[PDB]
Amino acid sequence: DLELHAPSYPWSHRGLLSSLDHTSIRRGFQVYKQVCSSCHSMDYVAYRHLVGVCYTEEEAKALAEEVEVQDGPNEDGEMFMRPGKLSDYFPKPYPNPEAARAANNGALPPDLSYIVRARHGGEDYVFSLLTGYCEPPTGVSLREGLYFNPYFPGQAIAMAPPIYNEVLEFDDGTPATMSQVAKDVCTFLRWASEPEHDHRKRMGLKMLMMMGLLLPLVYAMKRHKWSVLKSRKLAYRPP
Amino acid sequence: TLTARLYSLLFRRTSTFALTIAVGALFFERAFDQGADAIYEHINQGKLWKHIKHKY
Amino acid sequence: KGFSYLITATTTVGVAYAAKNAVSQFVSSMSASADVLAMSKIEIKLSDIPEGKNMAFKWRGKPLFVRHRTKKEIDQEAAVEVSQLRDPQHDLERVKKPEWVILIGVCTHL
Amino acid sequence: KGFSYLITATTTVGVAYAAKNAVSQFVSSMSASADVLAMSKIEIKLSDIPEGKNMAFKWRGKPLFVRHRTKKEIDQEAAVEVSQLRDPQHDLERVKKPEWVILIGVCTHLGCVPIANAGDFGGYYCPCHGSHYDASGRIRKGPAPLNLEVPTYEFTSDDLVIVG
Amino acid sequence: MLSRFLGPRYRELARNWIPTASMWGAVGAVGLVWATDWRLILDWVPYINGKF
Amino acid sequence: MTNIRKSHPLMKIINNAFIDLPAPSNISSWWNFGSLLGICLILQILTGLFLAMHYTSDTTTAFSSVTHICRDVNYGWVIRYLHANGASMFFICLFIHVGRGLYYGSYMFLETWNIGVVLLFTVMATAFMGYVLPWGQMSFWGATVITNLLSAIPYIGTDLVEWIWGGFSVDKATLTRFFAFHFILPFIITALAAVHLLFLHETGSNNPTGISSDMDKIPFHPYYTIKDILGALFMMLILLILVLFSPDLLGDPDNYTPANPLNTPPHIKPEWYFLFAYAILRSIPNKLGGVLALVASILILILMPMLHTSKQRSMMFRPLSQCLFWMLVADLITLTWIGGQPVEHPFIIIGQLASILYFLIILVLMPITSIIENNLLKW
Amino acid sequence: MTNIRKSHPLMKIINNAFIDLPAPSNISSWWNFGSLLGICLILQILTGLFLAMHYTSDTTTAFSSVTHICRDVNYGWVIRYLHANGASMFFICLFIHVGRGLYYGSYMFLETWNIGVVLLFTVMATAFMGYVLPWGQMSFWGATVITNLLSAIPYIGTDLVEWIWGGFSVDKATLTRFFAFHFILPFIITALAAVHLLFLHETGSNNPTGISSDMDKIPFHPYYTIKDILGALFMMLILLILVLFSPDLLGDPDNYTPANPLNTPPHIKPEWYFLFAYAILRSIPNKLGGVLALVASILILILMPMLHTSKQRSMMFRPLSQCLFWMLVADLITLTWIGGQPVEHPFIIIGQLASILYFLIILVLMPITSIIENNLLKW
């Protein structure tokens, strides 16, 4: 049995008021598009969401138009492909979960809209899972088609090594080493699970400053009103 | 003392008190929003989209 | 008295800011969501209909007639009882295109 | 007094009848609707299954396996002891019809790729996690959470078994 | 009703409460502009208009 | 001629319940929670309503509706996590309220105590049903387990669980009826809270000393309004810290996976505020015994006014009683942790001992100790 | 030693409410509608619950879920049509209640009358949203037509519509929003009804004669409880006849068609209990004037206590005012008939005449008649 606990990596978005590295989000989206999107999906995320966080409006248009999506019936009642727009969610690699399970051995590649918020550990778990593949220790014989990943529960995943060294070509020019790829994709998936992360921390900052300004003042008002009773001096004068 | 002048001017009448509160609401809201936003952008300089939009 | 009421005024100002930025929070929540703010930027080719026929589209939430008007109207609809005719309009200013007229479905009566 | 209270009593019994029916209306409304009493209700099979094979079914939103456990398979599963399983379940105890094993087909433990209709230790085997299955749908290799779940099947007659 | 409230001292009371009522109305106007964030008015106040 | 505050019918009730109510002048901060709970209730009624305007209760679209709330509605995430963590804060304040009742001997207010027990039951029911709406893995499976719990009832049990399910397993009908019951119940809670306050106001309140403070009462409005405002500000500080800094701190991550009825999660623990109850259920090997102990854990609060034997209403003048009270609190914490953990060798025995100790302290240790208390004080 | 009926707090409130409350001896049958309202409300709160237990709120499953309740849920159709026609029963009782209050000069109870006006507005809004819920052709198109009135409001008006629509047209957002609002509102109605009963009890009911009956007062319980039971039996007779024999009598058949925004029904009429006001809407070509008259048609009840000029209180001894009141009732019926028919000759001119006559009767004819009336009796 046993379980690896993913070590707490020092993510840039870890401090109480530390936002996400949106450049890392931009790179992680490309990593998803060229590698992970072959068999996973984030159906809850549409190209529109990328505008203003990792891509500009025209860039989001170009990204959407690179793919072909099913549309509704024509005047003849058929189904027709059309290039996407900033209203179509990320395409599903497999039309139905049965096809996904059949194609990838017998395992369903989970949808990654919430894969950081649904896994115990978060970005640490996914990062360690990707950069944690190793040759199985002696005495353990995995059936052909399964791969040993210690961090995966059961230590036997149906996942081919997703990211090797220099998988893709980062448009920025950053070297596409496996660790960089994993860090960028993990940050992007964290954004996918928590799109409000940056604004959440911003509102938390304003909340902290308002309470630090108010709580002393409301406490001062309470003392002001109660000071009649706190300084109240009694006296007993029986006959 | 200045506080006496404040009390005699803007605080004695309850309605003038409310007017002072209302105008303070405007100016405090603007000032606090500026300050908090500036502090956040300073803390995470170079990571927000506002700081990286220029290169696209 | 000024000191005490200044404490009161400052906390009231803070509460006013918080209350505004929470009630506007909720009200904006009730307003139109970003999914429908994927707003009515609709598209689509107009030459489908064979001249002088309306095709209904769902574009903002209510229908939109898209129509390649009859050849008679590009050149003479403006001449069809130009007079005054309550609200006077001509196809030249109604649609910049000669043919190819588009207009939302909501009637003018109710 | 008897006449007046007779009026009262007959009124009260009438109201009791009306209230019973009115309450039963709502209570039966909360109970299972017609549709769930039509698809989630029994889904009787037939004899469309030959020996050894396992006819796939989709009942109560879950797959059903009706593998025709042959005599040989019954011998292997009877010979195999119970403590070797993580959950001890005797072959005949879980399967009241040795020739027909009735088992809901769902790989336990998040469905890590099984192998269906074929198995090293029987008719099914699940190699993703240590989960080798029996021809009677019992866990064989690796302490998987449970065996393959068996529903409440009832053999009314030949080629007539109603299940969940 | 209006026969009773139409009096010399009644108009005199109205005059006494004119300042408080009028600048209560000013309080309401400023609060409405603030909470609503009425851009039409807020575009003219010097510091605040920088927000938009 | 007369003051409207004390002559107008509605204003008379408001005055006699919140303005001129004679409250003890020495009630500690532990008495603020009665306010906070009410405010929390309002907040729960409020945010939840705004959740009801974009949540569609159906199996094929409940989870997508919730994720659309948190991903596409303007500030939907604020409302959603406000609601979840506000329910958690509601239960924190509820437990602290019950602890204050146990400690300072407020259960001598029997009508209010029993109404409080009814409110407690209603709130646990409301939260349990509310946790089902997101239709996540933990939602679906926790609902399945807790509803299957009722099968232990003799004779009628299976019919009861199939009636609650609205079918044969937790499915569309269960989700819809849970949403409807979740909508209706908090208003029943509000009515019961009004009855709770009405019953309380006839006997005033219990100050920490436990002595009648009829010689020291002070008007409510000048003091306890600002006291409760300060308390509510503190509670809002805590709640907003939870919402804006660690939203899913008190939540199972697996709930962010759409409910797949073919895959049992490795852990099926309920919400954090139910584990103390849940552990009790896992203590008794018998199923019916488990359900009975589960219900009796909450119901034992009713027996407290009958089990009070000391001649002092409060506890501040009863040290050995304080030691047992804090032992009971530690036992409750242990039960919560045990319910969180799996049911294995080091935890089965700990849970059994914790449950036995909890019942034994409430029923046996405290009354005998109070008898010793009275004997020591020559009365 | 005392009655727990008149010493226990809740029992004391119930006793003073409807057990030992001094009621007028000569209360006619027209007062029964009061309770006939509350009972209807309870029924409406009841059945609606059992509807919300099988009703989704998405536009892809609204109509289908309603048909599911009607065809598949065990005895679900009884509940569905019981709600649909209990709404009409509620409004019949409401209109008769307002007519009673108007005729016998009960509007002298200013607080109760104003609270009643608030209740009328709330009930009308709740019924509108409820009729929107089943997502028929009538539902969708009536909702669009009614909400588009708010575009007439100057300045903010357009924004307001886009606010309530939750977008650009009545769509997925508005359906769920109206579901949540239709759920919450009836409990607000219940709270207001409780406040209403409080205010009425501070003065006591008014008898048909219009004169104070403090001398001939009888206990409520032995007499008016059974009178109200008989009234409830009669109302149940009418409602059950409606539901069991002719359910789709007061409805519109086009509501049994899935909502299609690309095509409208031949006629767009609202529910019957709204036509009286809708016709007034249609009277004035000025859209803003139309909306203002629509609001004033109900808000006139607020001014009604002021316009009372007769020395006497009721209409028992005012034959001229009696003919005026029946002219008003006939006028309301005429407006209701006009609302259904399309905007064509001669319905347009008849509608304008009826709408003019309504306000002319309420504002001018009645006070002048009362002024002549007092003069005819030496005072």
Ligand code: HEC
């Ligand atoms: C060509 C196929 C393929 C590629 C490429 C691929 N995956 Fe997967 N992935 C799978 C399959 C199949 C599973 C199911 C494994 C299982 O459930 O046992 C899976 C499982 C996962 C899990 C589940 C972990 C858990 O235990 O919950 C995560 C997270 C994941 N993938 C993320 C990624 C990321 C991030 C990338 C690339 C940047 C990626 N995948 C590339 C097919 C793929």
Ligand code: HEM
């Ligand atoms: C007694 C107070 C209440 C409690 C304790 C409570 C508790 C909860 C909890 C724990 C959840 C799960 C939240 C999540 O997992 O994300 C929830 C969800 C929900 N509640 Fe409530 N609730 C309360 C009041 C209300 C009310 C009054 C409404 C209706 C107006 C409501 C509507 C909802 C809805 C629609 C959801 C589903 C959306 C969601 O999961 O957040 N709640 N409730």
Ligand code: HEM
């Ligand atoms: C719905 C949740 C509840 C609300 C809104 C609520 C509300 C209140 C309020 C406002 C008070 C007065 C403030 C105070 O004395 O602290 C109070 C007192 C009290 N409540 Fe509750 N209560 C709730 C639940 C409970 C529970 C669960 C119990 C215990 C079973 C309970 C028992 C009491 C007692 C005994 C008092 C008297 C306290 C005293 O005066 O010493 N209440 N309640």
Ligand code: HEM
């Ligand atoms: C929500 C619906 C309503 C309920 C549940 C309700 C409840 C009641 C009840 C039970 C009574 C006592 C019985 C009676 O005298 O009729 C009453 C009296 C009264 N109601 Fe209503 N009512 C409602 C709507 C209205 C409306 C719309 C008005 C008018 C604006 C109104 C005005 C009155 C008046 C004036 C009385 C006193 C009648 C009298 O003294 O003769 N009510 N209400």
Ligand code: HEM
């Ligand atoms: C104030 C009392 C109420 C009135 C007057 C009222 C009125 C209506 C009306 C007119 C409809 C449309 C009926 C139709 O489809 O033809 C409706 C539907 C509905 N109401 Fe209510 N309602 C009330 C209370 C409630 C309450 C308290 C609930 C929630 C518990 C509720 C839930 C529903 C639901 C779910 C529907 C849709 C089912 C259907 O339309 O058949 N109603 N209501």
Ligand code: FES
């Ligand atoms: S993989 Fe099938 S049981 Fe573990």
